[PDB]
Design a protein around this ligand. Structure first.
Ligand SMILES: OC[C@H]1O[C@H](OC[C@H]2O[C@H](O)[C@@H](O)[C@@H](O)[C@@H]2O)[C@@H](O)[C@@H](O)[C@@H]1O
Ligand SMILES: OC[C@H]1O[C@H](OC[C@H]2O[C@H](O)[C@@H](O)[C@@H](O)[C@@H]2O)[C@@H](O)[C@@H](O)[C@@H]1O
Length: 237
């Protein structure tokens, strides 16, 4: 098959109300993978909301969202839900669900996103990921190099380093490119290569083409809460 996460449609909701966004999983065994939710404010970086293990219904939240977001599942319909309460204009954003694997601790399949608009109208410190440059204008064909530095070592107890790279093309959800520093995800071209160790990581693109354009995000999942870099927009001069 093919794996799909299908989210409910755009929501226009009044301030103070609640909203419950759905994410229907197909193509894989729903209870065998953590489902994670992400907020993306129109400004652009990704923020972890929380995880749910659908087999148990057990949850973990980013402290920022604890008290605001509630994650549930319906196993019978292979559907994950995120409810947001006491909505204000600051909740207006795009929300993604994404499947998290165990072998890579990476977000391998993403929903298409749900846009929430909140309006009255009718129609241990967290680990910081510093990405540079924030903007990389290039000529087509150029080599491109993007750096990601973490405030703490990303080496996990098991000796692996859970640093990953995602590409979000214009108007799409993020997609996994590289997991665990240097491993190319299925279908990703050899022109992408990831390197680095400890706190310093690099993504290189050997010959940029149009399908590579968008915003790149590094992410770490060695430490809780999971965190993302601020993005690097790769675009043509
Ligand atoms: O760590 C030893 C166990 O490794 C596997 O289970 C470990 C975790 O791997 C899975 O991806 C998840 O299902 C986890 O819940 C699981 O604990 C298994 O091979 C297990 O038989 C080993 O004991
Ligand atoms: O060997 C390096 C460190 O490995 C473990 O901690 C690394 C990361 O593993 C955990 O999953 C999280 O607690 C992270 O916060 C943690 O740094 C530890 O054994 C640590 O003592 C080692 O220094």
């Amino acid at each position: 098959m093919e794996i799909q996460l299908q989210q409910s449609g755009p929501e226009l909701v009044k301030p103070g109300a609640s909203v419950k966004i759905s994410c229907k999983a197909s193509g894989y065994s729903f209870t065998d993978y953590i489902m994670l939710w992400v907020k993306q404010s129109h400004g652009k970086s990704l923020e972890w909301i929380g995880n749910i293990n659908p087999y148990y219904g057990s949850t973990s939240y980013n402290l920022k969202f604890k008290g605001k977001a509630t994650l549930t599942v319906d196993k019978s319909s292979s559907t994950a839900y995120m409810q947001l309460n006491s909505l204000t204009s600051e909740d207006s954003a795009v929300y993604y669900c994404a499947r998290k694997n165990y072998y890579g601790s990476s977000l391998d399949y993403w929903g298409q996103g749900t846009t929430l608009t909140v309006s009255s109208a009718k129609t241990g410190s967290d680990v910081v990921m510093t990405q540079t440059p924030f903007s990389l204008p290039v000529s087509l064909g150029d080599q491109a190099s993007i750096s990601c530095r973490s405030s703490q070592s990303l080496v996990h107890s098991n000796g692996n380093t859970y640093l990953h790279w995602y590409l979000q093309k214009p108007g799409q959800s993020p997609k996994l490119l590289i997991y665990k520093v240097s491993n190319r995800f299925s279908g990703v071209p050899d022109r992408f290569s990831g390197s680095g160790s400890g706190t310093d990581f690099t993504l290189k693109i050997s010959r940029v083409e149009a399908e590579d354009l968008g915003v790149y995000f590094c992410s770490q999942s060695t430490h809780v809460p999971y965190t993302f870099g601020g993005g690097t927009k790769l675009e043509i001069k």
